[PDB]
Design a protein around this ligand. Sequence first.
Ligand code: ADP
Ligand code: P0D
Ligand code: MG
Ligand code: MG
Length: 471
Amino acid sequence: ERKTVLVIADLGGCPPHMFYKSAAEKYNLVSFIPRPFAITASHAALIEKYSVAVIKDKDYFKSLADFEHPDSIYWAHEDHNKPEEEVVEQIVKVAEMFGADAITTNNELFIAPMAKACERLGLRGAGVQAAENARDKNKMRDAFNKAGVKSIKNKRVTTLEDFRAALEEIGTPLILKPTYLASSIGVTLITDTETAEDEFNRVNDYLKSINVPKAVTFEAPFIAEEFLQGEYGDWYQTEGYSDYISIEGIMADGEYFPIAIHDKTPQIGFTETSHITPSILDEEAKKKIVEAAKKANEGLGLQNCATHTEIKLMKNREPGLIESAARFAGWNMIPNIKKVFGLDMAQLLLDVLCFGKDADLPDGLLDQEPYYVADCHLYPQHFKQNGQIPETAEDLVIEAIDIPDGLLKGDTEIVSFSAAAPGTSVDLTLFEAFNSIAAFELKGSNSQDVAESIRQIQQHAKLTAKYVLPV
Ligand SMILES: Nc1ncnc2c1ncn2[C@@H]1O[C@H](COP(=O)(O)OP(=O)(O)O)[C@@H](O)[C@H]1O
Ligand SMILES: C[C@H](N)[P@](=O)(C[C@@H](Cc1ccccc1)C(=O)O)OP(=O)(O)O
Ligand SMILES: [Mg+2]
Ligand SMILES: [Mg+2]
């Protein structure tokens, strides 16, 4: 007989078009929406369809205009001002209110509060400290160093003085990033000491302007850290991928169960472009990645959750840990694992949260892909790179994006292609990762052909649009 799962419904992780239908199959869902403005019209519709109960924070609603849902949201550009403890209390109350058996979220930002609520209720969860470890990058990097994985120098940074010391201890090149966000927001590579101060002041000012719930707490706002150098040629046998991978897994009563590795196409700066399900890497490479992710996620002390772990492919086949999340990967990675292997990770997670290791957990990475699926985005920068939009262009207005015939290698096909709606206005001022202007899916028998098709589409896609220039 059916169990009840509290989902903290917000942006990120497993996309609504899969999560709610997958969850509802065997579970009664209660949906808590702490941030009603973060819910798209289509997300809203899926929430009500598949939920036995829906609870929104009523304090957001002040007039009729508050009840409108946007068509598209990438990052929620509005304030949520409740302290962590108050958010925790809200989760526990909604859970008691409805007799919840489990709590899950797809949202990075509410991971730590969710953990506190779970343990306060005797339910399965990330573990209080482990979730903070998977959310505060200073704490994260520390746990990584103490675990058996590749260690790097790192330091907490709050003030300019902290940054200058960090630049003295650790050298050029160094990674400076906010400790508590996602989506590569604020993540900066400093390569020369002569303009390093200016860059820190720039990113410090920039950070103050990012909308984030007050419930996200942190030891220090920045981490300064060694840059993890990749060696493509030590890992991949063909071109088309990149220096890094993610690996998706599940933690179950403290044990790491790897599911799938994703290959990647080169990012734009630190903005991601494509994910390929599954990885083409050999069995020896995969084993190294799995070992790193096992040590890292167990090193965090994570108890019960989905896992999204990013790894830099370094010299001598050494896995370098970028970051790990106690939640599902974003974009279509989780649905694409289901298309390729037939495994529904959303159902698997809830099964683990309700039954522990009694769930149908795979031992080792899924294998015997019948083919490869690519999740790909296009950005204004692609159209600057290919000469269609000049560098100083302003306020792009997109009519259409079309893919010319003849760009696909081998048997690769376009399964779906979706451009921004005719007439949408894109602010070229925004951080690139916020500005996807098309999404497409590729399928093929041959990974290299898939990746090469991606590069071709990125190069040759035709934009129909208008932009502004100053005289
Ligand atoms: N120490 C590092 N060495 C090399 N690259 C890094 C490092 N930290 C971050 N990056 C790059 O920045 C991207 C985003 O940073 P990340 O640590 O994943 O934070 P988030 O994705 O949560 O913003 C990574 O995918 C990686 O490409
Ligand atoms: C694909 C990326 N690796 P991601 O999964 C992107 C986050 C972004 C996100 C968007 C809105 C709210 C929370 C997270 C997400 O979609 O959940 O994690 P990270 O690598 O950015 O940390
Ligand atoms: Mg993150
Ligand atoms: Mg990341």
